[PDB]
Amino acid sequence: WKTQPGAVFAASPVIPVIVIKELEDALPLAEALFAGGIHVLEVTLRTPVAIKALELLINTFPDELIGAGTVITPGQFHDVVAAGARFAISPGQTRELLIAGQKSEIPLIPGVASVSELMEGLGMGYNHFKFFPAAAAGGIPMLKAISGVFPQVKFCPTGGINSKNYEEYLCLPNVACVGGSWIVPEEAIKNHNWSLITELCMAVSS
Amino acid sequence: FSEWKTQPGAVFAASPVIPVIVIKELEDALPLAEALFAGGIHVLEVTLRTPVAIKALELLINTFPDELIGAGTVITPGQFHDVVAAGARFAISPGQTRELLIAGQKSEIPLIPGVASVSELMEGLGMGYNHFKFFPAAAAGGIPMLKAISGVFPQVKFCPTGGINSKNYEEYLCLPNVACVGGSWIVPEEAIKNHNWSLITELCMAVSS
Amino acid sequence: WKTQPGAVFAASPVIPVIVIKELEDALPLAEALFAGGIHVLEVTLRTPVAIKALELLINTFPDELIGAGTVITPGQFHDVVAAGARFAISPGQTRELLIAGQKSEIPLIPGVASVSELMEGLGMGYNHFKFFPAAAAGGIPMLKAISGVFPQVKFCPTGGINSKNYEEYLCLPNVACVGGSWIVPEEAIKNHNWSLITELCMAVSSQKRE
């Protein structure tokens, strides 16, 4: 790991959760994010073209922190490493995935939602996690309770984070950044509203 | 993995509501079953929550061999082997362990394990499971939890159980990743104790039609 | 196990979750707890002096049920056992910690927050658990739903339990006791407010019925 997990969190207060259904949208969406001050991109493995979109983004804009999300299996993890991803994010964790991230060249950010899941990740050497789905898995009260026992663990809450609540999450001492789709809404991507997306990103990156 | 003759999706497709059956008195098994059948419910989950449960399971399977009768509250591999040997057509669990998931993939009979977090779901997927009980649904994040999961695992199918009732079950059934729900409200212990088989049939008919 | 997990839960309706910053406060705090009827002490591994306080309390009061909390790792479990702890409590569980507790004469109370976590503990011989953080992880509805499927499993809910809600938790058939800092607030410890701590403990001791 040359890129440290903490670098995936320090890049932006908000990590955009990107769903790319059409490959032609990948590059103009990325340029819109860059113009809006966002230099970390999580390309989720949720569509057939996602791997090709990740490859296209890394080939075109290699000096951005472009990684993959929804990495569920070791096989997907090796696929995104091979595609050039700078990091891998998962909505949860498995033992196999945690093992795979130990010997990897790029950081894995596993997802957890209970103290035992956190402790399993900690035992494997991980101390940067996604908290997912944050709003449905206990929200701010959960993160405060965890902070009292694991003050040094750092989280990126994702899932139900939006304009109205994201500052409340960011203010927590164990929250390094948040993630969500509200700055890259699917409707604006589908309809090529790139300048709008820049404006939504500017509202959170300034 | 998951090449069972009886597929979990077929179990889920048989009824919008799987009744969570608690049988305390063996004499109640047949009339309770008749009330369910009459109310259009032909998938029965006999829970392993009472001393007579295994006997009631065996009695129901032997008496009604053409019905889709299985077991619930299957916690251990030993209990799973017990309900297989009793003739259960499926096993449902409120959660999962590696050993339980291993037992289900070694069996002719499908296992429907329980999950409540994304990591638990991911361990289940790693063992070839993609049909799960979500338990206890209402206390483990409810509809917002299921909606969040659907955006990330759109193919995974759930049977939410735990706090599902007449007033909210349709809200759960409308979700794209919910194939059916489970609950005791259509087989309530008060009606079973009173031998109120007409009421049970009426409750079942309301959800099956 | 020299002490049974159920004995840890049966000692008091409320286990005091102790954060001790100054070693000289350990003996006077114990006196305030004893005077309020409470003889189970959970010294949390959250301060530099916690291990030394644990050892001091056990050596001073060997006949009291003095144990450790916030035991995260097998290494910490071995440290508190060597320190003389009568029990160890964890906010969660891992396979490694469950294995370590199997090999000890000192009871381990793992923390769980889902049925699958409970089942992993059950499979390794555990049926007394902390439910943490109780108020944020599903609360009373979660415990009630679990009680129907695991009537043999006993819980100590901790995290967000206070004087306003603890009796509601205690009424549940699968809740043997609760844990909380509200009967041992850090401000009262720092200020040597033993009369307040004793008053708070006396209130929860009159709720002990077995």
3-state secondary structure C1-47: CCCCHHHHHHCCCEEEEECCCCHHHHHHHHHHHHHCCCCEEEEECCC
Query: Pick from C110, C112, C114, C58: which is nearest to C82 by CA?
Result: C58
Q: Which residues touch A63 (CB under 8 Å, ≥6 apart)?
A: none
Three-class HEC string of B4-62: CCCCHHHHHHCCCEEEEECCCCHHHHHHHHHHHHHCCCCEEEEECCCCCHHHHHHHHHH
Task: Select the residue of C46, C92, C133 nearest A142 (Cβ to Cβ).
Answer: C133
Active site residues of A: 42, 130
Is residue B42 within 8 Å of residue B66, measured between CB atoms?
Answer: no
Which of A:32-71 have CB within 8 Å of B? 44, 46, 70
**Which sign, positive or negative, has the C-alpha torsion A167, C181, C98, C141?**
negative
Q: Which residues touch C48 (CB under 8 Å, ≥6 apart)?
A: none
> A95 exposed, middle or buried (CB, 10 Å; 0-12, 13-18, 19+)?
middle
Active site residues of C: 42, 130
CA distances for B194 relative to B25, B128, B186, C10, angstroms: 12, 43, 14, 37
Whether B170 is catalytic is: no
How many residues comprise chain C? Answer: 210
Query: Pick from A180, A194, A190: which is nearest to A17 by CA?
Result: A180
Amino acid identity of C121? G
Q: What CA–CA distance (Å, rounded) separates C141 from C135?
A: 10
Is residue B161 within 8 Å of residue B134, measured between CB atoms?
Answer: yes
What the block records as the tokens of C22 is 């100054």
CATH number at residue A176: 3.20.20.70
Q: How far is B151 from chain A (nearest CA, A)?
A: 8
Q: Which residue has the tokens 């996690």?
A: A129
Amino acid identity of C52? K
What the block records as the tokens of C15 is 């286990």
What the block records as the tokens of A143 is 């993160």
Amino acid identity of C129? F
Which of A:127-156 have CB within 8 Å of B? 132-133, 135-137
Size of interface A-C (CB pairs under 8 A): 55
A40-44 and C88-89: which strand pairing?
A: unpaired
Helix, strand, or coil (residue B97): coil
Q: For residue C105, which phi and psi values (nearest 5 degrees)?
A: -80, -10
Domain count, chain A: 1
Q: What CA–CA distance (Å, rounded) separates A104 from A3?
A: 11
CA terminus-to-terminus distance, chain B:
34
Using an 8 Å CB-CB cutoff, list chain C residues near A144.
136
Amino acid identity of C94? T
Q: For residue C150, which phi and psi values (nearest 5 degrees)?
A: -130, 70
Using an 8 Å CB-CB cutoff, list chain C residues near A145.
132-133, 135-136, 159-160
Contacts 24+ apart (CB under 8 A), A192-199: A192/A25, A192/A28, A194/A28, A194/A29, A194/A31, A194/A32, A195/A32, A197/A29, A197/A32, A197/A33, A197/A36, A198/A32, A198/A33, A198/A35, A198/A36, A199/A36
Query: What was the structure determination method?
Result: X-ray
Which of A:147-206 have CB within 8 Å of B? 159-160
Query: Pick from C123, C102, C112: which is nearest to B80 by CA?
Result: C123
Q: What CA–CA distance (Å, rounded) separates A133 from A159?
A: 4
In the 8-state DSSP scheme, what is residue C108?
A: E
Domain interval for residue C6: 1-210
What the block records as the tokens of A6 is 């903490």
Q: How far is B209 from chain C (nearest CA, A)?
A: 28
What the block records as the tokens of A171 is 């203010």
* Cited resolution, angstroms: 1.6
Q: How many CB atoms lie within 10 A of CB B3?
A: 9
State CA A58 to chain mean position distance: 16
Using an 8 Å CB-CB cutoff, list chain B residues near A124.
none
Report helix angle A194-205 to A26-35, nearest 10.
Answer: 40
What the block records as the tokens of C136 is 């944020």
Using an 8 Å CB-CB cutoff, list chain A residues near C91.
115, 119, 149
Using an 8 Å CB-CB cutoff, list chain C residues near A146.
133
Chains that touch B (3 or more CB pairs under 8 A): A, C
- Tell me whether residues C133 and A115 touch, CB distance under 8 A: yes
Is residue A77 within 8 Å of residue A66, measured between CB atoms?
Answer: no
Report helix angle B77-85 to B98-105, nearest 10.
Answer: 30
A111-112 and C108-109: which strand pairing?
A: unpaired
Q: What CA–CA distance (Å, rounded) separates B46 from A87?
A: 47
- Tell me whether residues B144 and A133 touch, CB distance under 8 A: yes
Catalytic residue among B58, B67, B133, B157: B133
What the block records as the tokens of C166 is 């603890």
What the block records as the tokens of C13 is 């309706």
Using an 8 Å CB-CB cutoff, list chain A residues near B160.
none
Q: How far is B137 from chain A (nearest CA, A)?
A: 12
Q: Which residues touch A167 (CB under 8 Å, ≥6 apart)?
A: none
B126 touches chain A (CB under 8 A): yes
Task: Kindly state the helix (H) or strand (E) to which residue B161 belongs, with its residue range.
Answer: none
